[PDB]
Amino acid sequence: QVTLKESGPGILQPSQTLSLTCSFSGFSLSTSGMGVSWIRKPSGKGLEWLAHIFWDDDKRYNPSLKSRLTISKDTSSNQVFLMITSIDTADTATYYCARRTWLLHAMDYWGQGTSVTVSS
Amino acid sequence: QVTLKESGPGILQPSQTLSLTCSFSGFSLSTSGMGVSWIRKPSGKGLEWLAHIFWDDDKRYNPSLKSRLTISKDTSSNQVFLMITSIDTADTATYYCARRTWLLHAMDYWGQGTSVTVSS
Amino acid sequence: DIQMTQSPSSLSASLGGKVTITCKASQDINEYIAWYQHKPGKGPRLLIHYTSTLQPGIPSRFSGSGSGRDYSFSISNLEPEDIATYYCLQYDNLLWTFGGGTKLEIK
Amino acid sequence: DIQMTQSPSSLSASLGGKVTITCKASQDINEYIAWYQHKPGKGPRLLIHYTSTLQPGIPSRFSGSGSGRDYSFSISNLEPEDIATYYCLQYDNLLWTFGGGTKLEIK
Amino acid sequence: VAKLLLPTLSSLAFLPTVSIATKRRFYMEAMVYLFTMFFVAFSHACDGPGLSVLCFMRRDILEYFSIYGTALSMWVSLMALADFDEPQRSTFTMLGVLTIAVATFHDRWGYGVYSGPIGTATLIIAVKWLKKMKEKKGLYPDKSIYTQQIGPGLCFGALALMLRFFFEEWDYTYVHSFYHCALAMSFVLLLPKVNKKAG
Amino acid sequence: VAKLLLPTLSSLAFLPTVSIATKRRFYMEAMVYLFTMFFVAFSHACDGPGLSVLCFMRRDILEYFSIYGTALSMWVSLMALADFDEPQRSTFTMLGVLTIAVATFHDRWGYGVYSGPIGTATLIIAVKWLKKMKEKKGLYPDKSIYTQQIGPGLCFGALALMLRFFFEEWDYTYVHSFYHCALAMSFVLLLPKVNKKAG
Ligand SMILES: [Zn+2]
Ligand SMILES: [Zn+2]
After folding, report:
1. Exposed site from A41, A91, D42, F161, fewest CB < 10 Å?
2. Beta strands B114-118 and B11-12: pairing type?
3. Is any Cβ of chain F less than 8 angstroms from the Cβ of D67?
4. Interface probe with E: pick from F42, F98, F99, most Cβ of E within 10 Å
5. Residue E38 alpha carbon to ligand 1 centre in Å
6. Angle in degrees, CA A18, C101, A92, rounded to 5
7. Cβ neighbours of F66 in E, within 8 Å
């Protein structure tokens, strides 16, 4: 098996920072050439890539949003964490995390995806 | 000297065909590699190229307007003639004719230019 | 980042019929496309991980072709299980970019 | 046909000052630009018939430079006679295309 | 008897190579394989006594250009595998031409004439691909390219060079035919599927 | 006495040529001029008795590559004057390499070694430019290119070849220095102002 699972607050206010957390098994991000990705479907839009984090602790952010993403990792729990700051009605989306490999670079296992909505 | 002169009706109705005539001296279009050009400034716009006619009787038309231009030549009078068909308020312009050479391809003598306006 | 357009935003197709999606990239992306089946209420599956190379455990009806700015994804004699939203991923740059997605529907 | 943009649509310049016009082509046009001085109420004069080659009988203040999609036209210490509308002509294809023209004005 | 003709006739193993290279728009590489096919054929045609009468240049020339042509065919195949941009493509193509020309002159029969090109080509290829693996953080030529061009191409390359430099000592007549065949397949399998720079 | 060194020392006339070609991003042509500068220097260094002790390859090799290098320098200069797209560029570059290599081998000292390239280059150039003059209905390379590259470059070309093939019969010592100088200036003046394919 290979598995990823997305966990977060779901419902919260705008003008806030949210934590999104990815927990995974069948592999470890400590493995050479291994990477974990963050991607979201905004409500009724095509898919949007957010962030990468890699085995070597190298990191990459979407230029449109890079000012308000902070990714990080824990190989003890086998988890990866992403923070979106200054959250807004445009961030009403399903958020996914996915495992990229070395042999082929496109992600080959996605998590089930978790809903985020920001409202009063 | 080299000279070109533009002559035409000036003021006329829309939904009509107009004849524009270019008469020139100092050279003849019978000369090897010689060409005469038609170009217009529409009222308050940048310059617009219309048509070419060449010593070998080869001809070229602006793709935007090509359906309503007919160029022709007379080396006996040293004149070139251009017809614009189905004339419209967009054709309110100053029309120029200019001499292209073989050694350098851009036109090097323009005529003084003649006004065209189409109105009721 | 290199924008991509999947030509059909949605397709209506007969069960047991052929269907194809065309993807056009804004620049040459050196055959680094992957095609995903997003079945609603579940995480997407990887079908094709190069222009044409299928992932192991994917039925042989799925195929892709094309090279340099124009690629195609194809199903031969589609099953009712194949009704999903289909995305192309550009992955040449680490600035990953998706197409708009194609919502396939049964006729 | 290959569209071109002269960066300034109009310029305000001191008599005896330097002034420059930048032309950007939509494709590479292989140094086949010519620059024209359209003095109002008269037929245009050819100043420069390649990127840099002046027409005979043109004062030495006029000069042009650049290559492949970006060219520049220049006057050094301009006279009040030099106040005119300046056009660039693309003449690579026989589909001749002008820039929008730059109306130079005295400060 | 067939052993007279078989070293000459097996030189036509490159006729598939030039046909494929031409179809894939590799027009330069198609010259170098066609040139080699011609000079390898006439190099063997002079040596066999029963058809030595047909060939029309001195042994020195046909010998040199059969070796040079082969060594350059290896080079342009390897400088086609690693696709380079115009200033590096034209430079590295010419680096092979000038190096192999001198190497073939300086010591004609020495394994150096192939070791120099294959060593330099492998260094240039490996440095380009290791830079690209560091940029993309993944196996740069897709596993499909490794399993269907590089692996098979170099497998035939090792087979050809071990037929030429070991097993030619046991027999010349069939082994040198297997060498012409094996090496013609390296020149096919090392080429990309299309010449990308043809547009 | 200076007549010993002057045929060797005047080979450095190509050092401006390689410096200019490198600055204009003509990196392949810069190899061929640098290669020629080296092999022309050592070709003359062996012949002069008072410095014949320094050179380290056999006369046959340095003689061949001084002639081949020069004939290919003419070729790549003329295939740089007529800028070609990638499949034709790579093909016509290699057509020169393979033709001149055989021509220099087959009759080393024959005027054919330069006549073949200059004739073929002029045919390929003239056919490309006449097609482009018919397309544009005007003098295709601007009068500025004719008066500042083609005219001067071929003027030095005629001077060099008439110094080599006529007036070398009257004197070798100074005339062959004027030849090295004249031909180094053809290789400068025939090159375009920039390598357009470098991007
Ligand atoms: Zn052989
Ligand atoms: Zn010499």
Report:
1. D42
2. parallel
3. yes
4. F98
5. 11
6. 20
7. none
Segments making up each domain of chain F, as ranges: 2-192
Q: How far is CA E47 from the centre of its chain?
A: 22
What CATH number does domain A3-118 carry, 3.40.50.2300, 1.10.10.10, 3.40.1280.10, 2.60.40.10?
2.60.40.10
Whole-number Å distance, alpha carbon F145 to ligand 2 midpoint, is: 29
Q: Which of F51, C88, F92 is nearest to E93 (CA)?
A: F92
Which of F25, F28, F105 is facing E61, going by the closest CB pair? F105
B113 three-state secondary structure? coil
Which is nearest to E104 in space by CA: E70, E56, E57? Answer: E70
- For residue F176, report the distance from its CA to the centre of ligand 2, in Å: 6
Contacts of F88 in chain E (CB under 8 A): 27
Q: State the SS3 of D41-94.
A: CCCCEEEECCCCCECCCCCCCEEEEECCCEEEEEECCCCHHHCCEEEEEECCCC
Which residues in chain C touch residue A98, judged by CB atoms under 8 angstroms apart?
43
- Write b or e for each residue in F169-184: b if 16 or more Cβ atoms lie within 10 A of its Cβ, otherwise e: eeeeebbbbbbbbbbb
Q: To one decimal place, what's the resolution in Å?
A: 3.3
Distance, in Å, from the CA atom of D87 to the CA atom of D74, rounded to the nearest integer, reads 12
F with C: touching (≥3 Cβ pairs within 8 Å):
no
Structure tokens, F59: 């006369």
Fold (CATH) for B3-114: Immunoglobulin-like (2.60.40)
Regarding chains A and F, contact by 3 or more CB pairs under 8 A is answered as no
**Spatial contact of D20 and D77, defined as CB atoms under 8 Å apart:** no
Q: What CATH number does the domain containing C15 carry? A: 2.60.40.10
Name residues whose C-beta falls within 8 Å of residue B119's C-beta, 6 or more positions apart in sequence.
B11, B13, B14, B89, B92
C-alpha distances out from residue E55 to C7, E44, E69, E196, Å: 61, 9, 18, 39
8 Å CB contact of F197 and E64: no
Three-state DSSP state, E74: helix
Solved how?
Answer: cryo-EM
Closest-CA residue of chain C to A47:
C98
Q: Distance, in angstroms, between F191 CA and closest chain B CA?
A: 22
Measured in angstroms, the CA of D86 and the nearest CA of chain F are apart by: 23
d(CA B118, CA B100): 29
Please report the number of interchain residue pairs, chain E to chain F, with beta-carbon separation below 8 angstroms. Answer: 85
Contact E39, E63 (CB under 8 A): no
Number of structural domains chain D divides into: 1
CB E70 within 8 A of CB E30: no
Domain range holding D88? 4-106
